[PDB]
Design an enzyme around this catalytic site. Structure first.
Site, PDB file in Angstrom:
ATOM      1  N   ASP A 374      -3.734  23.551   2.451  1.00 37.93           N
ATOM      2  CA  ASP A 374      -2.496  24.116   2.963  1.00 37.93           C
ATOM      3  C   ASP A 374      -1.338  23.807   2.063  1.00 37.93           C
ATOM      4  O   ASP A 374      -1.422  22.928   1.226  1.00 37.93           O
ATOM      5  CB  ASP A 374      -2.174  23.681   4.389  1.00 37.93           C
ATOM      6  CG  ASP A 374      -2.450  22.261   4.649  1.00 37.93           C
ATOM      7  OD1 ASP A 374      -2.382  21.456   3.685  1.00 37.93           O
ATOM      8  OD2 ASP A 374      -2.737  21.882   5.821  1.00 37.93           O
ATOM      9  N   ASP A 393      -5.669  27.815   3.203  1.00 39.34           N
ATOM     10  CA  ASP A 393      -5.298  27.405   4.548  1.00 39.34           C
ATOM     11  C   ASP A 393      -3.821  27.684   4.814  1.00 39.34           C
ATOM     12  O   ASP A 393      -3.166  28.377   4.037  1.00 39.34           O
ATOM     13  CB  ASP A 393      -5.642  25.939   4.811  1.00 39.34           C
ATOM     14  CG  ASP A 393      -6.277  25.747   6.168  1.00 39.34           C
ATOM     15  OD1 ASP A 393      -5.558  25.977   7.171  1.00 39.34           O
ATOM     16  OD2 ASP A 393      -7.476  25.402   6.322  1.00 39.34           O
TER      17      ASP A 393
HETATM   18  O1  LIG Z   1      -7.849  24.262   8.657  1.00 39.29           O
HETATM   19  C1  LIG Z   1      -8.564  24.885   9.705  1.00 39.29           C
HETATM   20  C2  LIG Z   1     -10.068  24.666   9.549  1.00 39.29           C
HETATM   21  O2  LIG Z   1     -10.554  25.409   8.444  1.00 39.29           O
HETATM   22  C3  LIG Z   1     -11.950  25.368   8.234  1.00 39.29           C
HETATM   23  O3  LIG Z   1     -12.719  25.943   9.309  1.00 39.29           O
HETATM   24  C4  LIG Z   1     -12.515  27.333   9.439  1.00 39.29           C
HETATM   25  C5  LIG Z   1     -13.608  27.818  10.385  1.00 39.29           C
HETATM   26  O4  LIG Z   1     -13.260  27.380  11.687  1.00 39.29           O
HETATM   27  C6  LIG Z   1     -14.289  27.612  12.618  1.00 39.29           C
HETATM   28  O5  LIG Z   1     -13.845  27.119  13.869  1.00 39.29           O
HETATM   29  C7  LIG Z   1     -14.588  29.108  12.717  1.00 39.29           C
HETATM   30  O6  LIG Z   1     -15.654  29.341  13.611  1.00 39.29           O
HETATM   31  C8  LIG Z   1     -14.930  29.706  11.356  1.00 39.29           C
HETATM   32  O7  LIG Z   1     -15.094  31.114  11.469  1.00 39.29           O
HETATM   33  C9  LIG Z   1     -13.839  29.327  10.356  1.00 39.29           C
HETATM   34  O8  LIG Z   1     -14.219  29.739   9.057  1.00 39.29           O
HETATM   35  C10 LIG Z   1     -12.432  23.931   8.035  1.00 39.29           C
HETATM   36  O9  LIG Z   1     -13.846  23.947   8.031  1.00 39.29           O
HETATM   37  C11 LIG Z   1     -11.923  23.035   9.171  1.00 39.29           C
HETATM   38  O10 LIG Z   1     -12.221  21.678   8.902  1.00 39.29           O
HETATM   39  C12 LIG Z   1     -10.415  23.191   9.370  1.00 39.29           C
HETATM   40  O11 LIG Z   1     -10.003  22.444  10.507  1.00 39.29           O
END
Ligand SMILES: OC[C@H]1O[C@H](OC[C@H]2O[C@@H](O)[C@H](O)[C@@H](O)[C@@H]2O)[C@H](O)[C@@H](O)[C@@H]1O
Length: 572
Positions: A374, A393
């Site tokens: 981010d 992000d």
């Molecule tokens: O910063 C937010 C988040 O980003 C990443 O995850 C994204 C995924 O989140 C899942 O919940 C969703 O089901 C997927 O479709 C997304 O790609 C990262 O892995 C995570 O640690 C962060 O919190």
């Protein structure tokens, strides 16, 4: 082999004697990854006296591949196969980000050549983003492309994009595909970003003395080498973390610079390139200034600074590029000039007290292909201007009152919104974001948990929370442009009230996505007891105005705002 640079008060370029062309693996510790495709030169405008300007290159996973620890052999696939690090198809298509920075105070010509001698196309095949600022572009007789860059107190930060180099990202709504599916983005295979930067304000170059300043020596950064002076100065050269925390040599990406409390200023000279990350400990106002680069390229995804820098996520101890965990009060971070490259995690967090703000300008973020990369926190009353951030992000995290963000260019990958205001209930007022140019997005999925939107608010991060009717968010967002087949304007899960929330002068010149993935659709679901006081004006899509008769889900605006809010919001 010897470069011809120029450095005066009119303009300044630089070089590195350890540039390395490498599209596959880590560069050598003392080397700097150099563009395999482009050269950039700068001349005073119209004088045909061109000088070399180094072109850096950053690649997905940094040449390390899917690895769990920074000591693992590159591309050895030790990261657990179930971990999505935000990268999938990008290496197979050769995606990378190249950039060149110079300093200037007078009109220059910037000349671009392909290093293999070939043609980049004609000037009509060249697009410069953000498109809000147009350039005179011509062709030199050797097939080069020449861009006239006028002097500008705020500088210029732009992407140069060649038609025959463009890659079309295709998605089936779940993953990127090599054919079929739907178009979710069109952007350079081989990105080239130019940072035409103004010389630093005099006050932002600290006056150095032997007792005042630890002058670093190009080479391995072993533990304690950064000393305990007021200022940590990296003059031109290449530097790299070379030890783990216990003092063992020949280990990259296995430590960061935990500054002494005395040290309140990090100065990166133009032409300094530091593979590392900075954690401040001072309680005075603290500084990161200068036109050098800080790179996280030796760190694995989510590198955990509280656990031997391995790829285990921790919200509290995974490594930030700019970090503080020690409190104070009435502190301001002054960030003027730096570029960060290849962050392994969230780029900036200052923890310990609530008393913190930042003045961020002429600040760049590149090669941020990993999830969770981010933008910097936007602490209370922060003033941010003239930034260019590549992110996978949240780009602009409006969690605090009184902040201004002006002249921000965002290059989004495929995760989370441009503006983020969610994750928890917040009380915010007095925020202005003006002149926001979103020059690329390439969302794979249509999502609300991580909003695939310009203006987004994620639902609750932690469980067991309820929306708060006595909190409210108010801000003004103006002069927004999203370029390309764009994602939705709004995806907000209301965790509190919205009131006096102004969105004015917003354009999607290339239209919203209208595909079956559904990313183009704005979504604001019902939230009992909460207001949605949005005042939207001068919203256009594809040159056509969005009004009260074509806003709806199945029409131009694709604005699926829940009917329960009727009367609280207006489009005009
Ligand atoms: O910063 C937010 C988040 O980003 C990443 O995850 C994204 C995924 O989140 C899942 O919940 C969703 O089901 C997927 O479709 C997304 O790609 C990262 O892995 C995570 O640690 C962060 O919190």
């Amino acid at each position: 082999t010897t470069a011809n640079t120029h450095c005066g008060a009119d303009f300044c370029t630089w070089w590195h004697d350890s540039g390395e062309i490498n599209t596959q693996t880590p560069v050598q510790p003392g080397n700097v990854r150099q563009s395999h495709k482009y050269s950039v030169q700068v001349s005073l405008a119209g004088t045909n006296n061109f000088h070399d300007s180094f072109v850096y290159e950053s690649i997905p996973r940094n040449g390390n591949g899917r690895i769990y620890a920074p000591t693992d052999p590159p591309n050895s696939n030790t990261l657990d196969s179930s971990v999505d690090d935000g990268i999938s198809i990008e290496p197979s298509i050769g995606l990378n980000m190249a950039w060149s920075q110079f300093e200037y105070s007078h009109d220059v010509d910037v000349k671009i050549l392909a290093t293999d001698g070939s043609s980049l196309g004609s000037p009509s095949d060249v697009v410069i983003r953000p498109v809000s600022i147009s350039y005179a572009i011509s062709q030199s007789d050797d097939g080069g492309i020449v861009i006239r860059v006028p002097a500008d107190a705020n500088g210029r930060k732009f992407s140069v994009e060649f038609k025959t180099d463009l890659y079309t990202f295709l998605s089936d709504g779940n993953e990127y595909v090599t054919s079929g599916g739907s178009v979710v983005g069109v952007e350079p295979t081989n990105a080239l970003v130019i940072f035409a930067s103004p010389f630093l304000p005099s006050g932002m170059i600290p006056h150095m003395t032997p007792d005042n300043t630890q002058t670093m020596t190009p080479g391995p950064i072993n533990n304690g080498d950064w000393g305990a002076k007021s200022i940590l100065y990296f003059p031109p050269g290449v530097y790299w973390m070379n030890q783990d925390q216990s003092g063992n040599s020949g280990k990259l990406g296995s430590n960061h610079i935990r500054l002494n409390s005395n040290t309140y200023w990090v100065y990166l000279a133009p032409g300094a390139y530091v593979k590392g990350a900075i954690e401040y400990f001072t309680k005075q106002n603290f500084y990161a200034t200068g036109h050098g680069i800080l790179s996280g390229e030796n760190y694995v995804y989510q590198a955990n600074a509280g656990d031997n820098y391995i790829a285990v996520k921790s919200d509290s101890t995974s490594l930030r590029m700019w970090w503080h965990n020690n409190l104070g009060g009435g502190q301001t971070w002054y960030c003027v000039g730096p570029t960060i490259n290849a962050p392994p995690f969230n780029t900036m967090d200052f923890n310990g007290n609530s008393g913190i703000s930042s003045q961020i300008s002429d600040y760049k973020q590149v090669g941020a292909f990993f999830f969770q990369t981010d933008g910097p926190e936007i602490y209370p009353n922060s003033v941010v201007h003239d930034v260019f951030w590549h992110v996978n992000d949240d780009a602009i995290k409006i969690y605090y009152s009184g902040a201004s963000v002006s002249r921000a260019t965002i290059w989004k990958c495929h995760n989370d919104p441009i503006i983020q205001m969610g994750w928890t209930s917040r009380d915010i007022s007095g925020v202005t974001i003006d002149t926001l140019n979103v020059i690329h997005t390439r969302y794979i999925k249509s999502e609300t948990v991580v909003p695939s939107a310009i203006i987004g608010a994620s639902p609750f991060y932690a469980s067991g929370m309820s929306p708060d009717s006595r909190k409210s968010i108010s801000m003004t967002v103006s002069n927004v442009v999203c370029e390309g087949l764009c994602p939705s304007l709004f995806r907000i899960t209301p965790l509190q009230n919205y009131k006096n929330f102004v969105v004015k002068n917003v354009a999607f010149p290339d239209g919203l996505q209208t595909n079956s993935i559904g990313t183009g659709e704005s979504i604001i679901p019902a939230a009992s007891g909460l207001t949605m006081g949005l005042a939207i004006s001068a919203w256009t899509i594809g040159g056509q105005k969005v009004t009260m008769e074509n806003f709806q889900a199945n029409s131009l605006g694709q604005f699926n705002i829940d009917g329960s809010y009727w009367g609280e919001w207006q489009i005009s």
